[PDB]
Structures are given as structure tokens and as C-alpha cells.
């Protein structure tokens, strides 16, 4: 009677490698390896995906409505919030139907900040009456930093509605003891790269 010390590492290594091959082919709803200077757009999407229900799920980005558009001028007098409006038509072009979408992620690049600013997030409802989404406590930093807000239900509601322009609000926390606090945090692409939605959707081809 002698308990063996360790299992042979190369055997379990190829066992895990074959199981990983099976996992990769099973995530993509595939059974065979498909065959056929790739552009920089997928580089941008992949690099955005890296930094921060079984099967593999399509990812696609839709960008901000540009700042020069005539939709932000209605609320430009407000200087304590950043207004992020997204074209629902491009979202529906990326995600043709609601139920296959599973996760929506909003990204915000901060070029440089030096203050303790506690931010919030809202959406339109087109009444100019906003719902609460989620806050984020931002510490000063010397490097660009991205942010992530859970807006899955937001984009699910946007897909259940007609194509148009519905968007977000990036408002500073304003407690009832200190009202009208100015937003001291800066978001790239708004204040003198731009924010975008990151959509985790089940692909239309496989489901």
C-alpha cells in the first residue's frame, strides 16, 4: 500500500486541452473549425471588451450621438451633468430583436481628474423625468480610466420602443444639505474615445 504522490501532469494537461477544445466548439454552437490585414474597428471593439447563459454571445459597440448634434443644445445650460444620448436605430441594427440581448455596458473614459466626485446615472423616459440606474465613487487618478454601468434593462426598454434618440444623464451627487453641486469630473468626448454602449447579445444566426 503506497499512495501515489501526484498524477502525471502531461496526461491531465492533454485531457484539459481536449476538454477546452470541446468547450470552445460547444460555446459557439459549432462542430467543425470554420475557414475562409483585418480592420481596426474590431481592434477597437476587442480592446474595449478586454478592459473594465453558457454559449458564446455576440458583442458589438454603438457610439455616442456626436456632440455637434442639435439634440444636446436643449440642456447645455446645465453644467452639473453630462448628457449621453444614443441612437436607438443603431442599437437595433446591432441587436435586431430584444430577447437575444443579454447585457449592455456603458463605457466612460475619464482623461484626468483630481477630486473626490461621486457620480450618478439616469435615463430619459421622455417626460424629462429620470430613473435611477447606479452610482460610482470616483477617486483621483493620473491615468485614463474607463467606467461600467449596468444598462441591460435600459437597452431592453429601448428595444421595446420605437427607433429614436433616448439617452443618459451623468449627474454629480447632490445631497439635500448641499444642493446644486457642480460636476467636477470630466468625461472624454464631451468636455473640451467617446462613450459607447457595449452590447452582449445572443447572435441571430445561432438562436
Amino acid at each position, epitope marked *: 500500500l503506497s499512495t501515489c504522490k501526484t498524477i502525471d501532469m502531461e496526461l491531465v494537461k492533454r485531457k484539459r486541452i481536449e476538454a477546452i477544445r470541446g468547450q470552445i466548439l460547444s460555446k459557439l454552437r459549432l462542430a467543425s473549425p470554420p475557414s475562409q490585414p483585418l480592420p481596426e474597428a474590431v481592434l477597437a471593439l476587442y480592446n474595449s471588451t478586454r478592459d473594465r447563459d453558457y454559449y458564446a454571445k455576440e458583442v458589438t459597440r454603438v457610439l455616442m450621438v456626436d456632440r455637434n448634434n442639435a*439634440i444636446y443644445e436643449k440642456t447645455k445650460d446645465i453644467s452639473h451633468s453630462i448628457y449621453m444620448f444614443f441612437n436607438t*436605430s443603431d442599437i*437595433r*441594427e446591432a441587436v*435586431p*430583436e*430584444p*430577447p*437575444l440581448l443579454s447585457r449592455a455596458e456603458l463605457r466612460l473614459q475619464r482623461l484626468k481628474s483630481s477630486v473626490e466626485q461621486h457620480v450618478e446615472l439616469y435615463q430619459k*423616459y*421622455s*417626460n424629462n423625468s429620470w430613473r435611477y440606474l447606479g452610482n460610482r465613487l470616483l477617486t483621483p487618478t493620473d491615468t485614463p480610466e474607463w467606467l461600467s454601468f449596468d444598462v441591460t434593462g435600459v437597452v431592453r426598454q429601448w*428595444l*421595446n*420602443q*420605437g*427607433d*429614436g*434618440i*433616448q439617452g443618459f444623464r451623468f449627474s454629480a451627487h447632490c445631497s439635500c444639505d448641499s444642493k446644486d453641486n457642480k460636476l467636477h469630473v470630466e468625461i472624454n468626448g464631451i468636455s473640451p474615445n467617446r462613450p459607447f454602449l457595449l452590447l452582449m447579445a445572443t447572435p*441571430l444566426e445561432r438562436a
Partner: antibody
Amino acid sequence: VQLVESGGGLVQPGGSLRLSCAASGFTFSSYYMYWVRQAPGKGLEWVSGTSIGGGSTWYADSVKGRFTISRDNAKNTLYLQMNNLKSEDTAVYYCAKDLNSRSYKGMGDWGQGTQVTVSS
Amino acid sequence: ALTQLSSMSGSPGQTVTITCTGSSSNIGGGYYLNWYQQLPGAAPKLVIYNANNRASGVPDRFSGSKSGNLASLTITGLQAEDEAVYFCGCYDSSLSSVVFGGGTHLTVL
């Protein structure tokens, strides 16, 4: 582009019926689809709408539950299942396309419409 | 829902405007507002989508307007073929439905 329809005829109150909308000239499994009715002497009124594939379907508030929509993307046809008809359903139910492919924004090419009525 | 006049008369050769006013959920929500003409004994036809753009097969005589809660369609010169009921259609996010307005019977002469 044309959208012929079928499934009219008089229906007894409280009954059921189904309408079909054959579509041609465009990629049917790439567009949202809408049902719009119009009673004679009264304006247009939205009835139902479905996504690309039928996963998400929307119905008007006044007609929710009674009507059910579905798609058959292989045969380029789409159905509207009437259930429990009542007296304000006497209308011509038009079947309509959408402007762009992956979009829910408006009604593009329409159909000829078929007349569905309920009476004694 | 969508406030639109019921009857609007006129004469050939003028420039008259069909109005369409809502409640900031349909017109003011930024959604695509459409313009449908219903010829007598015919199906509704797409004319102006998003209140700016002209549909295919439609002459440049038609033009739409979009301002706040007010959206309208203008025709420069009325002929016999324009004698139709006009509907403004836009998605409403208050009722969560694509509600139409009460069409106006455009009568020429």
C-alpha cells in the same frame, strides 16, 4: 413588393379567426412587421407588431391578449390570431412592412387589406 | 392621442399645411414620425418618414416639418390626385404603441 392577405369573412361574436399575410419582393426574415386596422369611417389604428423572428411581440393596449401575432420566416408569411371578438373589431386589417431592415420606426410598403367583421 | 384636425378644404394651386400635435411622448420623444396618405378606396401610402425625408416614388412636391410638439406636412400645389385622407403616424412611448392621428380629408376644390 406586395403583401397579399387572407382570412376575412363574417365571424360570430365571441368567436375566433386567423389572418395570414404572404410577403414577397423583400427579405421577410429581416424586417419588423405590423398589423394596422381601419374601421370604415374611422381612421387607422395599430393592432400588433413583431420583431425579426417573433421573439418580442407588441400589441395595442385596447386589443392586448385577444390577438396574437407570429411569423413563419421560411414561407414569408405572418399570422394574426383573433380570439374572443367583440363589436368594435369590424375593420380592414392591413399588413405592413417597415422602413429599414433592423428597425422599429414606421410602416413602409402596405398591403391591400382584407375586411373582417363581426355581427349577428 | 395625436391631435389632428378632422376636415381641411381648399382649392387647387395653393400651399396648405396639415398639422399634427401630440404630448411630448410621441412627437417630442424623437421617434420616427411618418406621413400616410389614404387615397379613396386604396391602401395607405408612405409619403414622409421622420418628418423630413421623402419616400421613394413620391414627388418632391411633398415636404414635412418637425418642431418640438408640432409636426406638419406641406404641399406646394394641390392637384386632383392629392385629394386623400392624410394620417400622421409616430411611435408613442406613453402608450407603448404606434398610435395614429385622426386623419383629415384633404378636399381639392
